């Protein structure tokens, strides 16, 4: 009984290259395959254009690369969801699956020259138009400009064709204008549902002479600290010289979105050598609010508003540090990187993410799961620590409680969290599992990664597994497909995996084997895992000094600038006075934000594994279909469950 299987991405996109996996299991000879895509329902013949031949010595597996053309969008804002029918014929046999379609063409990014503007000035902004592979593409893009009240005052429709994915643009802010937060909105012509936006502030301002930066000794506040909140004020000129002046500093408590000032926290301190110190006493803090219990203040934040005035009295600059948490503990525990399902009898790998109250990853923090002794781990650079526990064969859900083991804390100050994992369910209780283990962390492009395939099943049928089928999913598409061979008797095999720049920001690895089980029954066993890759650029862009370091350049002098980048690329530049950022540092363009937008656009909703093979595929953002009837469930939802 030769079995034909098709693997596709969970959701399909328009005007983007998608790949499809064709497999013929237990077959003979060269099997021809034709792939057709139609509208659902009916026949529009969207793409019939991909034809291929599966052969032995190719081990009966093949790629199909197609790009689905766009009807664009007639309707509607309301939707609703559109599906397409993917059908594949191997010589005779027909296997078909209907797939959900997202209208997203690609990504759009908007870069404004400054973070703040004046009435009667010009806002310069570029629009980067890319596909899902973040490659440059000429396309039609709709642009709108919304005032604070939300009314678009200007809208155009532009083409990025022959612009190399960069659209230079400008808008003149009127002299009679509404003050507030202005927004630049943009979207693709074929996809009005996906809108990318940026903000910029219009205000009456002047660039200051200097900048003020206030910092706490630590980024949180311990409720029982008698010292109170200690704040160091730093004020430096734009040219780097320190300052001499007088500063006014006051504190406050933030709960919800509501702020409450502390009147008796007002202090006037001298500024000497561009520095100063001020302390909010616990007495003043607890007196300001009449709520007698101190523990009630936990889960609230503090804010410091410092105002530095020069000894000339000409220039005055204010600054604020907000969101200083009042906590019982310096740390917190998060399971968002750990799979929620386990293989009974097989090692379960937990990834615990310990963070500081500000969200910054904690560094070198002891953690453990009760209980107790043998397991311990220290958090890495990314703030994640690995804890691997052994697993009982029982069907009882696994309840895991993780605590921080750091010394010098009274256990009242220790962070704890409790998770639960569920047993992977097999076919007909055959108890045949598959365990993918990837250990190494802080992975970078160019490195190789050993993937450990651990097979669990009775040795009676073990000789029938000659291979594992693996898929590398990245950025919502299929990055790679392959076959890892297995000789009879090999329970654990290793697959070397080369890591290119195409795995950034991260990737998913799914694998499955299939065999005929007890009494003529087809069983498909699968497992998945998620691997984080170091976030970075694909290429490199550096801007440095072109001359030796002697002394600072004088206004009016020429400066040679060195740029280090990829061959053939186009580089756009901007220069901003740092006095600007004193007023507004928000909404600045950053690669981190790009990869964040990409990682939010991922169709995979889980860190790994699944409740069953169908669950494994679907959760990892894949669809598996077979002529024997084994197939994934249907996801009609566009977003990730939450």
């Amino acid at each position: 009984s030769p079995m034909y299987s098709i693997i596709t991405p969970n959701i399909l996109r328009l005007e983007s290259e998608e790949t499809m996996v064709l497999e013929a299991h237990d077959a003979q000879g060269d099997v021809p395959v034709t792939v057709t895509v139609h509208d659902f329902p009916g026949k529009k013949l969207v793409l019939s254009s991909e034809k291929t031949v599966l052969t032995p010595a190719t081990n009966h597996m093949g790629n199909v690369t197609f790009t689905i053309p766009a009807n664009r969008e007639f309707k509607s804002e309301k939707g609703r969801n559109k599906f397409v029918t993917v059908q594949a014929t191997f010589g005779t046999q027909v296997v078909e699956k209907v797939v959900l379609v997202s209208l997203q063409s690609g990504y759009l990014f908007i870069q404004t020259d400054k973070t703040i503007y004046t009435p009667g000035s010009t806002v310069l902004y570029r629009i980067f138009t890319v596909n899902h592979k973040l490659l440059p593409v000429g396309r039609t893009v709709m642009v709108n400009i919304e005032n604070p009240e939300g009314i678009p005052v200007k809208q155009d429709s532009l083409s990025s064709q022959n612009q190399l994915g960069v659209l230079p643009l400008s808008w003149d802010i009127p002299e009679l204008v509404n003050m507030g937060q202005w927004k630049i909105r943009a979207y693709y012509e074929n996809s009005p549902q996906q809108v990318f936006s940026t903000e910029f502030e219009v205000k009456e301002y002047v660039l200051p002479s200097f900048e003020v930066i206030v910092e706490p000794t630590e980024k949180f506040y311990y409720i029982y600290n008698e010292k109170g909140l200690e704040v160091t004020i730093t004020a430096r000129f734009l040219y780097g010289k320190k300052v001499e002046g007088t500063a006014f500093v006051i504190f406050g408590i933030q709960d919800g979105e509501q702020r409450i000032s502390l009147p008796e926290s007002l202090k006037r301190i001298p500024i000497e050598d561009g520095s100063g110190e001020v302390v909010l006493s616990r007495k003043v803090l607890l007196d300001g609010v009449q709520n007698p219990r101190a523990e009630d203040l936990v889960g609230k934040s503090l804010y410091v508003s410092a105002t530095v005035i020069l000894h000339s009295g000409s220039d005055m600059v204010q600054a604020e540090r907000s969101g200083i948490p009042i906590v019982t503990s310096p740390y917190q525990i998060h399971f968002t990187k750990t799979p929620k399902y386990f293989k009974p009898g097989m090692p379960f790998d937990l990834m615990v993410f310990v963070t500081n109250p500000d969200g910054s990853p904690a560094y070198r923090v002891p953690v453990a799961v009760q209980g107790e002794d043998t397991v311990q781990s220290l958090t890495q650079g990314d703030g994640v620590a690995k804890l691997s526990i052994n697993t009982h064969p029982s069907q009882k859900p696994l309840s895991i409680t993780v605590r921080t083991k750091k010394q010098e804390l009274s256990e009242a100050e220790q962070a704890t969290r409790t998770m639960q994992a569920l047993p992977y369910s097999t076919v007909g209780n055959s108890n045949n599992y598959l365990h993918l283990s990837v250990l190494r962390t802080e992975l970078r492009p160019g490195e190789t990664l050993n993937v450990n395939f651990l097979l669990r099943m009775d040795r009676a049928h073990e000789a029938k597994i000659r291979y594992y089928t693996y898929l590398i999913m990245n950025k919502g598409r299929l990055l790679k497909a392959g076959r890892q061979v297995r000789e009879p008797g090999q329970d654990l095999v290793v697959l070397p995996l080369s890591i290119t720049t195409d795995f950034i920001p991260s990737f998913r690895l799914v694998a499955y084997y299939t065999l005929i089980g007890a009494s003529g029954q087809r069983e498909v066993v699968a497992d998945s895992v998620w691997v984080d890759v170091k976030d970075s650029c694909v290429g490199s862009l550096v801007v440095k000094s072109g001359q030796s370091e002697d002394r600072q350049p004088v206004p009016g002098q020429q400066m040679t600038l060195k740029i280090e980048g990829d061959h053939g690329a186009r580089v756009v530049l901007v220069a901003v006075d740092k006095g600007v950022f004193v007023l507004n540092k928000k909404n600045k363009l950053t690669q981190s934000k790009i990869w964040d937008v990409v990682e939010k656009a991922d169709i995979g909703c889980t860190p790994g594994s699944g409740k069953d093979y169908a669950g494994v595929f679907s959760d990892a953002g894949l669809t598996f279909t077979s002529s024997s009837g084994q197939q994934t469930a249907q996801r009609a939802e566009l977003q990730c469950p939450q």
Partner: protein, 903 residues
């Protein structure tokens, strides 16, 4: 001065951009180890600050990359920082500051600082005289130099200061810009809201609208305005009756089985379920895997059905049984609908049709059943009618018209048979006694468009309550007939009648799929599918809007459609003008016109929360006493406050007096200024812990003048709360000037600077006749009068001399006849230099720019170019010291009057 670079030789730094280097560069450099390197030689701007450079790279391979920021620190050893606000108010006196920074480690600099003269400002710097100070700046320090100016003309003006140090090459200058805002506040006046409905509210389907200019009564002259026009389309959706919930359709998937009849009974619900779910797009809640399965069932039903197809192409229950007309017709009716689903052989279908026509059709156009079907529950309401000739003829005819487009170009006898049967249906229609037949034959005739006039009226009036077509009997017949009637209405496109019908069908809660439910199910779902297929979900929207502005000969065009309904149209004009809107087409629009402008509203300028009184009094070199009294406006005393005090040039506070305040309670003075040298403190800041809201909190200290100089500048006192700089109060102090105010002359909303010389430089040098003649013959000089001072009216500010003109030597743009009085205005402080007293005579001449108010009512102003010469009395001319003057006066007068100028 001694060994110093001149002011004129200094080029000030004018460029202070907040953003630049918008440059675009491609890397063409051949890669060395994968990295291309381009070197950029660029030009740093005038600003002293750190410039941050952000780069983004776009490659056709590697994609997008956002580089990390790069900083460049731009600084000098000695420089000027000129601190200007964002905007200043016209005619209001303000004090800006120029802070000189010397960062040199061991070296102190002797500095000369000068403010440039601008016609747009009133300062101590005149046209022929500069305003310059000489101050010493210690190593690694800074010094603030206050300047007091009054803005004059609106718009964006320019302020420029220069400085250079003695015995060194060091120099610097700063040229910045500042916005001069007139008195007022931004106000949004809503002009017009107009509702657009060219169909309902328009004439001839066209609605034109007239929009007048905005009021703008309180608008400030010469100020701008912006009129904004918004066109907002309004979507109108019509309620479309609820489609049948797919949860009720689940039972309609049935595996086809049995012989020639049963096979169709089982094929029926599975075929129509797809048809309906396809149009209603309910598969998502139904599930997508079910469809293809159903398609397999359909293909099965068809394939099995082909086993009952006789050589005659006719269909019958069993191969041994005589062919059934109705069964074959129903097979045609089903396979016709199945074309959208599964592959079907046209030969089988059109073959069955051809057999129907060439066999079962009578010469009168009637189709007749020779061999009745075995299941009488599968034929629906064909029973009991006794009209069955008509009913069957209709059924068969419908099955023929559904298969037409496929079989038309194949079977030649199809249209013939169609029209043949159509005549028969047409002739007998009016005699129909049963609603069911009226419905089926109604739809039968409607596909020909032959249901018209009396027949159509018979069809419509048959419906009870204009909702349901029904006869007494079993319900299924009434439902089926109602379905046929719905297909009829939809065929004739009468949508007024439709909704009450569909509302009734869905109300019956009939999902079909039971014993003998074939006809009911099939027809009700065919009808309810065609309904949703043909049902409009919206009212047609096409808008043609045009705009006629008197300021633009160009025609403004905007087209609004139903996909545009979400989109908002915006148009702007800076000129306030009445304009015309020409609208046309279907749909409902909304028009909004709103202007933004500047209001004449006063005052808008005040010390908000602070009352400030400053009094400087002579103490019993020179020592004076400065006293500052302040009170906060509110229900509570203010928190920590700031007193920013500048100095009259050449003055310093008494160093001793400061300590008592500083060491006193509630008062704080930084030690920085306390141990600072007596010299070079022109700026002192007194930090107050509080200021009372009840009674005035006052303080005072002595000030010594260490440098004597002519024309000292008033000092300033600024009180403000540390948390808010925007709310403050500014006061000036001068011993010889009222309230610290500079001399300026204002009427209406316009003011001119009084800080120049009171009049032309006096004699000596003693004036001769050629001097007066040549000077008065200058083309610029407008008027020359001989006058007599009538009465001196003094005021708190400006002196008004009433001069009666006794004769007019030269006349200007003003029309003035001999004997008419005129008023001359002079700044106080110039009164004792003028030494004018009543009854004496004077000679005056001036320019055309010195007039006060507009013609022909004028007052004269005495400026730097204004000539005033005392004319001795006739009896006083006999005196031996008046001789030359009198001779010159008479001479000049008659020479000017009689001969005029040679030029």
């Amino acid at each position: 001065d001694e060994d110093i670079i001149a002011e004129e030789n200094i080029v000030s730094r004018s460029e202070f951009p907040e953003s630049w280097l918008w440059n675009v560069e491609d890397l063409k450099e051949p890669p060395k180890n994968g990295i291309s390197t381009k070197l950029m030689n660029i030009f740093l701007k005038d600003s002293i600050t750190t410039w941050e450079i952000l780069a983004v790279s776009m490659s056709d391979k590697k994609g997008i990359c956002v580089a990390d920021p790069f900083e460049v620190t731009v600084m000098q050893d000695f420089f000027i920082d000129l601190r200007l606000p964002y905007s200043v108010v016209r005619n209001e006196q303000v004090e800006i500051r120029a802070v000189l920074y010397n960062y040199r480690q061991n070296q102190e600099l002797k500095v000369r600082v000068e403010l440039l003269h601008n016609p747009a400002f009133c300062s101590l710097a005149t046209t022929k005289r500069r305003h310059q100070q000489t101050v010493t700046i210690p190593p690694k320090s800074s010094l603030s130099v206050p300047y007091v100016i009054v803005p004059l003309k609106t718009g964006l003006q320019e302020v420029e200061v220069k400085a250079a140090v003695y015995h060194h090459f060091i120099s610097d200058g700063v040229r910045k810009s500042l916005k001069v805002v007139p008195e007022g506040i931004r106000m949004n006046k809503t002009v017009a809201v107009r509702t657009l409905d060219p169909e309902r509210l328009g004439r001839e389907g066209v609605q034109k609208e007239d929009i007048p200019p905005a009021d703008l009564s309180d608008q400030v002259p010469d100020t701008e305005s912006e009129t904004r026009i918004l066109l907002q389309g309004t979507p109108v959706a019509q309620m479309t009756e609820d489609a049948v919930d797919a949860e009720r359709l689940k039972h309609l998937i049935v595996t086809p089985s049995g012989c020639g009849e049963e096979n169709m009974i089982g094929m029926t619900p599975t075929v129509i379920a797809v048809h309906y779910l396809d149009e209603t797009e309910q598969w998502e809640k139904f599930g997508l895997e079910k469809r293809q399965g159903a398609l397999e069932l359909i293909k099965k039903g068809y394939t099995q059905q082909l086993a009952f197809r006789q050589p005659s192409s006719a269909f019958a229950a069993f191969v041994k049984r005589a062919p059934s007309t109705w069964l074959t017709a129903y097979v045609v009716k089903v396979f016709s609908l199945a074309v959208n689903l599964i592959a079907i052989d046209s030969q089988v279908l059109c073959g069955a049709v051809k057999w129907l026509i060439l066999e079962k059709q009578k010469p009168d156009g009637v189709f007749q059943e020779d061999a009745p079907v075995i299941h009488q529950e599968m034929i629906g309401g064909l029973r009991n009618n006794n009209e069955k000739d008509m009913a069957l003829t209709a059924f068969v005819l419908i099955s023929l018209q559904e298969a037409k487009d496929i079989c038309e170009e194949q079977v030649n006898s199809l249209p013939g048979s169609i029209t043949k049967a159509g005549d028969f249906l047409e002739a007998n229609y009016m005699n129909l006694q049963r609603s069911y037949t009226v419905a089926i034959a109604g739809y039968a005739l409607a596909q020909m468009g032959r249901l018209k006039g009396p027949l159509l009226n018979k069809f419509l009036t048959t419906a009870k309550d204009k909702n349901r077509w029904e006869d007494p009997g079993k319900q299924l017949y009434n439902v089926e007939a109602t379905s046929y009637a719905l297909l009829a209405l939809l065929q004739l496109k009468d949508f007024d009648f439709v909704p009450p019908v569909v509302r009734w069908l869905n109300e019956q809660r009939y999902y079909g799929g039971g014993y003998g439910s074939t006809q009911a199910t099939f027809m009700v779902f065919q009808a309810l599918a065609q309904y949703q297929k043909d049902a409009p979900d919206h009212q047609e929207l096409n808008l043609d809007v045009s705009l006629q502005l008197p300021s633009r000969s160009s025609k403004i065009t905007h087209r609004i459609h139903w996909e545009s309904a979400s989109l908002l149209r915006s148009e702007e004009t800076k000129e306030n003008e009445g304009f015309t809107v020409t609208a046309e087409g279907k749909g409902q629009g909304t028009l909004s016109v709103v202007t933004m402008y500047h209001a004449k509203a006063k005052d808008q300028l005040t010390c908000n929360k602070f009352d400030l009184k400053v009094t400087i009094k002579p103490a019993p070199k020179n020592t004076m006493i400065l006293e500052i009294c302040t009170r906060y406006r509110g229900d509570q005393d203010a928190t920590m406050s700031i007193l920013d005090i500048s100095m009259m040039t050449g003055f310093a506070p008494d160093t001793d007096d400061l300590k008592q305040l500083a060491n006193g309670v509630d008062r704080y003075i930084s030690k920085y200024e306390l141990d600072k040298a007596f010299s070079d403190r022109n700026t002192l800041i007194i930090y107050l812990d509080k200021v009372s809201h009840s009674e005035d909190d006052c303080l005072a200290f002595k000030v010594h003048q260490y440098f004597n100089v002519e024309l000292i500048q008033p000092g300033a006192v600024k009180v403000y709360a540390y948390y808010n700089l925007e709310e403050s109060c500014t006061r000036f102090y001068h011993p010889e000037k009222e309230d610290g105010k500079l001399n300026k002359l204002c009427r209406d909303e316009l003011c001119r600077c009084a800080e120049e010389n009171c009049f032309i430089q006096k004699s000596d040098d003693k004036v001769t006749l050629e001097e007066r003649l040549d000077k008065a013959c200058e083309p610029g000089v407008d008027y020359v009068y001989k006058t007599r001072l009538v009465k001196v009216q003094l005021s708190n500010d400006f002196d008004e001399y009433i001069m009666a003109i006794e004769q007019t030597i030269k006349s200007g743009s003003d029309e003035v006849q001999v004997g008419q009085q005129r008023t001359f205005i002079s700044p106080i402080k110039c009164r004792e230099a003028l030494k004018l007293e009543e009854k004496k005579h004077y000679l005056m001449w001036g320019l055309s720019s010195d007039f006060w108010g507009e013609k022909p009512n004028l007052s004269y102003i005495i400026g730097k170019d204004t000539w005033v010469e005392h004319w001795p009395e006739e009896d006083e001319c006999q005196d031996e010291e008046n001789q030359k003057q009198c001779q010159d006066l008479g001479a000049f007068t008659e020479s000017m009057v009689v001969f005029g100028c040679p030029n």
